[model samples]
Target: MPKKILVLHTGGTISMQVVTSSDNPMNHVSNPLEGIQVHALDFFNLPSPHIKPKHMLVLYQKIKEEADNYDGVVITHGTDTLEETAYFLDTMEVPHMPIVLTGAMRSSNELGSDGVYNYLSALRVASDDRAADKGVLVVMNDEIHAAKYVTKTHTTNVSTFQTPTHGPLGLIMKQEILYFKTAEPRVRFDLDHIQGLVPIISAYAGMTDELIDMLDLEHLDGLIIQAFGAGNIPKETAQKLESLLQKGIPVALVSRCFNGIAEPVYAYQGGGVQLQKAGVFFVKELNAQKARLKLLIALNAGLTGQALKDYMEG
Candidate 1:
């Protein structure tokens, strides 16, 4: 029997056409996938940059509403904010079937279009039983990555999506989906409304408190700091952040480096130890953007004090 699948094409270069000079999303007639009973929806046609948490929330709601009727689900999104959407969906616990997200760096009319190939790979991964409970998979360049850890590293490279910390979960081959390490169990939450004004800041060498003071901290809901190696910040910046913590505004920290996890290291004035003592939560593994989303979700979910800190560190 053919596997039933739901494909949500949520606008990106995959559905775009290069007209005259620039690439624009074309309302083109899409071809059906062979051997699969497909239920496809063109959810949105906007570029990835325009995608927001509200759109992601609606997408999740739709998927949650229709999940049981299909064997699996596939989403084609713009690469710009694909990871954020994927991570957002991963935070929720729903749909026992495989949920795969894929997109292309090149448009349909481009000489070497990867859209169709990636779409097929995503469909195959979604339909496979092994992909279930993988906590959302990002299929691109023949590799399967857990949405919790995948990030678009390059600006325009075809193989831009990478899982830097633990590597890819598996691979999509011509004949089968290769088995790989399983996704680590992550804390899942059910969110009804996505709300927050969380902003991310990166710490630099000799950074001062000026940038931190510029923001109306009273109006800011939460903040994620991409601190230096192992989550240290400049002494001045750290002192300024203490004010936010004192005000009960949650602050989370993650490493600015591409690789390691942020930890409470160093004991100097602006060290990770001092930041932790100041009530800053050191988020493990997740990048700054993801950390921001997690903080937003945690805050909106009414996770506070120890519960909020635990969830952020989780």
Candidate 2:
């Protein structure tokens, strides 16, 4: 039997080209990667920013329907929010074969183009026998990263995508992948639609209560507060945060810092201890966007209260 790989292009720098009018080249010039051929199953050409949860749902639907026929799947995405979309699909659990997401920091026609190599690398991993049990992967800069902890650190650097604290799972050399460690088992969920709208906001010095006050927190499906110094929020916002938890709205906490995880450490008025005492939860490592997506998945999976806390902590 022939091993077939499904290549899906969901626009990003990989599909864009430099515009010629002034200086900014961020416009959607063309699908420069369309010329790169494969046994493509489907393609979505919209810019990555417009790629909402609805768009992701459609891709998962297609993958769920046709994944059995293909040996692996490859996706091209924008760097700005690549991790989010990849994380979204990682939780879907519909992929039986490997599903690898790849994107480039530079456009296809730019100097030192990386799109081609990354795309090819994704296809290679997708078709490999070793990738079968591993969950969704982000392939870039000759490094293979799990979708769970990989984040974009630099603005324009090709090596921006990194797994902070926990490092890359593997590296690509020639045509072979060398994995250093195996990931623990991940819980997967099947979803027809991603229900519940969860919004995450930042916590910083001099931040006011106005943002949380106007959120209509009473009716919100879920909320994530990106806190400072181990899950502590500003004093002004703590009371209202407690109000939401009391009303049965699940509030998960994550740190705004790049590397370390968030937990209940401080015991002051607006500290992590107070928040935890009020029944709010904290995530071990995920950033705001990934945390938001995970919280939504947990809610969609019908998890609540202690189960939600345990899942986020896990």
Candidate 3:
């Protein structure tokens, strides 16, 4: 039996031209890929920034329903929040099925068009037998990144997707899919809907408690702070966070720096050590955005106290 691959296109640069005009270049394209059945479908035409967790939940359900019929799956998405969607899907239980997400930094009509190339690369990675059970992946510029750590590093460069500290799990070569390392198993959860309101706040120089004061704590489910250095924050902000933590709200801290994990290192007034003592969850490696999603899922999954802390730090 021929292998079947499902290609889901969520509006990004790859499908930018298709939605605007009647040419329908992407959806109606002929399958040049041999020995595989390609089921190309348009899942959404909205830009990446416009994509929300609700949209992500729909895609998750589709994959969950159809995982058995297809050998693998490829998704084309906007780069702006691609990592979040990938990570969101990563939390689900999709074992042994390669789900690869890719997007072009440039539109289809751009001078140095990368949409088509990246789309093809994503399909190749999805169909490769080696890609199974590797978790959700972000493929761009010939590099394959685990969704858990990949982030958009460059604003407009084609090689924008990168996995900091841990590095790429593999690379897409001329005639092969090369994997140098395996991804670590992540904490997985079963979520029917994207619930809770988790906002990410960054700690800046001279930052005050006013930032936290503005939040309506009643509706706030959890919080993510991109702390300075290795998770230290201003004394004022630290003092203010006490109220929310005391209310049993799960607060997770990640580093604002591009690389490195957030830890409880300092013992100052508003230092990471103090934050940890105050019950702040220090998440390892994940940036603020990803951490927010994790926190949201944990909260919706009914995780609290030590269980929530373990999942946040997991």
Candidate 4:
């Protein structure tokens, strides 16, 4: 018997088509999944959900409800926020099954579309037992990447999704799955008991200290800052961050650039460096959004500063 797979379609360029309109030359047909065709697989097309934390929770619940019969799951998502959704799913414990997330840089209406290949590749990954035990994955351009390390590198390139800082988990060469390495210290959480935490990221570019000072940190448990090169920020902003630390909130720093670790450089200006000294954590290989989500899960698991650092390093 053929394996069963759940295809969760979320709105994105992949599931969109350009429609000609009198007023606008470029209008998108909002419902592009209506035309997608796949065969030789037990496929289920669910509603196209948006990329939001609450929407992710709803998707998680839906998957959990029908997970028993399905052998694996594939999610077609918008490339814009695909990493966020993939990380969210990683934190939630699913049965030992392959869960692949995929999308296309080009729309279905494009001259040489890539959505069909993306959808098919995702299905192939989901059906492979090699992908079963791995956590959430993003399969694009025939490369398989761990969701935590994958990022959108180009805005409109068909091969946009990439894992630059760290190599991908494996690759698909000539329709064959190849494994390079497995993720280390893979942490899993109980979805039912885990708390729903959200981290809002703010960038520091001509940013004012008063901006963060005005916000109430009492209600928030965690926050992430997309700092300048090597995690540097204004002195005044660092002071405000210290104040947040005083309130017993966990703050993590991530670089705004594509890749690399956020080293301590603000100590010279007595700004973010001082904040780092005062217990603000740094995420080693994680980007801003991933850093935020990881901080939320670490805090939920009651991990301390050092412990959180260790997890990030891993």
Candidate 5:
């Protein structure tokens, strides 16, 4: 029996085309299901509606409804907001099926187009039953990455998506599936309970208390801070963040720098080291957005600041 794969198309460069009259390319926003060419695969089309949490929930529900009939699934999404969508899918509990998400750095009409290649590779990965139980996967440039660690590293390169510190779960070589690692089994979070846990993330630079104060912390369940190098922040911002933590809101600290862990920066010149001492959750290798999602899931699961920190660090 031929394996059936459901391909969900979302608006992105992959589904965009350049217009001869206008210099700017136009995306296939309205009719996303039209004009896509997939080779010898059972495909289904769905709109992503950008990367908002509500859209993700809708997508999740659709997948769940039709998951049983298909062997695997592939989701096409925008590269700019793919990480957030991927993380949301990763944390959410779903049925046992291979779910591969992919996008292109270049539009189909652009020179050296990557959409076709990405689509083909994603199809191959999704069709393989070996991909089952691997959690959510992202296929781009022939590399299969775990959704938990994959991030876009380049602006326009076809191979922009990478797993940074951890590398990819596998690589597709000569039409063969190759895997290097398996995802660790962990407790899954209830998607129903996490319906509206909005996590607002901000980075520290010329830090000010105004920005922190402006955030509607009362409405937000948790906060993710992409602090300066090694998770440091100015004294003023740190004080304001501390107040939020006192109110029982969890603030997760991550490094803005790429390819390193956010550690306690001691010297007292900047309050990064002090922030760590004040019980701010430090995200080890997880990026700011991933940290935000992790914190949301943790908080929804009733984990506290220190417990979330242990989960992140552990």
Candidate 6:
């Protein structure tokens, strides 16, 4: 008997085609996922870059409402922002079913396309019993990565999706989906009421105070600052950050580095220590974009003060 894998095709290179004789971006196409041998079907055909938080919420709601009708859910997404969508769904509490997200780095007509292979691998994982309750899984290049940690690391390689600081939870050996690890126990946030007025910015050398002050804090719900080194921004930016904290608008700090989590290590003037003392909070372990989404979710849940600070920092 064939497994009933619910296929939701959100446009990416997997459902796209190269218009000319080149190896770059292309236009979307009617996805081939619907014709796959399994009980495959297309839920939506939108492109990944076009996907927003609202779409994620809609998909989350749809899956929860229809989980009992299918064995598992498989989403085809764009690799560019696939991690955010995967992470967003991870916050919701629709467990007991496998929710796997996959994408391709090359167009369908390209020489070495991996779309069909990746698509089939996702379905196999979705059909596997071990995949349930492992949070959201990303199957790419034969590696099974947790959505909480997978990030696209390359522009054109087939093995672009990577889990930094942490690695994949499992692997694919032909027809078999094998598991060798598990994610840490953590709290999940359900965005019953989705919100996103927060914005994110990156820290750089010789950063100016003017850049940090440009945001109209009155009009913003929160801000995520990607600080330099162990969460330290320029001395100028750190001083200006206090004003945002003073206004009760939360400022979540994350390190700009690709690996290593954020911390208040430096004790010098305008360092992480100074920033922490000024009421600015560090959202450790997350990058700027992920921190922004987490802040959005926390604020939408009406978390405030120490509670909100603690939620984002985790």
Off by over 4 Å in 2: 12-37, 104-115, 157-159
Model 6 lDDT on a 0 to 1 scale: 0.75
Question: What is the clash count for each candidate, in the order shown?
Answer: 0, 0, 0, 0, 1, 1
Question: Using alpha carbons, what is the TM-score of model 5?
Answer: 0.79
Off by over 4 Å in 6: 12-41, 104-115, 157-159
Superposed Cα deviation of residue 221, candidate 4 (Å): 3.3
Please report the TM-score between candidate 4 and the true structure.
0.77
TM-score of each: 0.92, 0.87, 0.92, 0.77, 0.79, 0.88
Q: Please provide, for model 3 over 224-243, each residue's C-alpha lDDT reduced to its tens digit, 9 standing for 90 to 100.
A: 88889888999999899989
Across 197-279, the per-residue lDDT of candidate 4 in tens digits comes to 44666666577687787676667777888877777777667767767888877778877777667777656653556657777
Residue lDDT tens for model 5, 256-278 = 88887777857574466677677
* Local distance difference test, each candidate: 0.83, 0.76, 0.82, 0.68, 0.71, 0.75
Higher-ranked by lDDT: 3 or 6: 3
Candidate 3 weakest lDDT stretch, 10 residues:
15-24
Error of 6 at 52 (Å): 0.7
Please state every model's RMSD to the true fold in angstroms: 2.8, 4.7, 2.7, 6.1, 5.5, 4.1
lDDT of 6 at 269: 64
Which ten-residue region of model 1 has the weakest summed lDDT?
20-29
Residue range 1-314, candidate 2, lDDT tens digits: 44577767676333334452121132222222333224553367556677788888888888888877777777877777889988888888776688888873353444433336666677777767788777789998788899988988887745478999878988888757888887876888887777677987888898868888788865699898888967888788997776687778888889888886787878887898888888888887888999999888888888877788888878
lDDT: which is higher, 3 or 5?
3
| Candidate 1 Cα errors over 4 Å, as ranges | 12-31, 108-115, 157-159
